[PDB]
């Protein structure tokens, strides 16, 4: 009824605990009101719209799990994000991406070398500095900031069989950016458990020692699961 309307904006809170308890309450009374016929209260109060909103792009296991349980109890379907299919791109999409991020002054060079999505996702600093013309380290740092923002929000489904992206995202959302370096080199979820650090450094292109160490321990812990 009208009491439920007070619990409708609380979810917009900045802190975690408010969101957690709001989701626990709504999901619990959804489970209560689910067996009877009255499920139409969620329709006309418009809480379903906020739930269908917040489930996508959320890295919070408790609230997202509760929202999924609430939606699947009402017989609806959970949404999923619509991410760019970066590793199957051509030069036109690369150039419009360069228009979008603001590096429009380099669109000529990226056209002459015919850089596409597979070549975009495997760029290093030598290709940037020597032949693409980004001389200043500040500009390369800005470019890599934008690139690593893109790489965490791509769609690797056309090339990732073993679903490595979710395994990397479960550790830390910042880690998903490495998935293409693990797949093009050949790895997968089954044979991951016996890689060395020195192979992670130059083949998979992981540079931060902390990320190498966390990935190594988390992989090596999943030692002989099959």
């Amino acid at each position, epitope marked *: 009824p009208d009491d439920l309307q007070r619990l409708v904006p609380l979810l917009d809170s900045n802190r975690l605990e408010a969101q957690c308890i709001g989701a626990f309450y709504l999901c619990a009374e959804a489970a209560i009101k689910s067996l009877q016929g009255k499920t139409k209260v969620f329709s006309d109060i418009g809480a379903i719209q906020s739930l269908k909103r917040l489930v996508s792009y959320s890295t919070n296991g408790t609230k997202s799990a509760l929202a999924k349980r609430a939606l699947r109890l009402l017989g609806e379907e959970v*949404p999923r994000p*619509i*991410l*760019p299919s970066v590793p199957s791109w051509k030069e036109a999409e690369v150039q419009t991406w360069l228009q*979008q991020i603001g590096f*429009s002054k380099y669109c000529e060079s990226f056209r002459e070398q015919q850089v596409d999505g597979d070549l975009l996702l495997r760029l290093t600093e030598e290709e940037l500095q020597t032949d693409l013309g980004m001389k200043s380290g500040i500009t390369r740092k800005r470019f890599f900031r934008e690139l690593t923002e893109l790489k965490t929000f791509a769609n690797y489904s056309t090339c990732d069989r073993s679903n490595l992206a979710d395994w990397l995202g479960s550790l830390d959302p910042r880690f998903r950016q490495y998935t293409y370096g693990l797949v093009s080199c050949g790895l997968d979820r089954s044979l991951l458990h016996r890689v060395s650090e020195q192979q992670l450094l130059e083949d998979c292109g992981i540079h931060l020692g902390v990320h190498r160490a966390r990935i190594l321990t988390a992989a090596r812990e999943m030692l002989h699961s099959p």
Partner: nanobody
Amino acid sequence: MAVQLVESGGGLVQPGGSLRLSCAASVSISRIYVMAWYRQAPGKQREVVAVIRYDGTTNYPDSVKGRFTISRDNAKNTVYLQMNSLKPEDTAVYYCNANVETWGQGTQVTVSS
């Protein structure tokens, strides 16, 4: 699966004066990562005029800062562009853009008597 975008608005106005363009999609906008508006003048190539992400952070080029404004509307799946103070050189065909790949068809916009 392939999202379809349709624009609306356009036409012609006088120098000085506002207009609002609308772009409607086939799915929920709140699932799409980025959406953007693009502008192609006759005799030149395309360029960006506004972008907006899933969390509602927007970037504008320096050319049109303060004069344009992009917003999502979650009631009906539609992204709006608001053009407040117009110049004579702001006449072109405008396109709506989903993530990167998918385009719209465009709407012509002209500014004169």
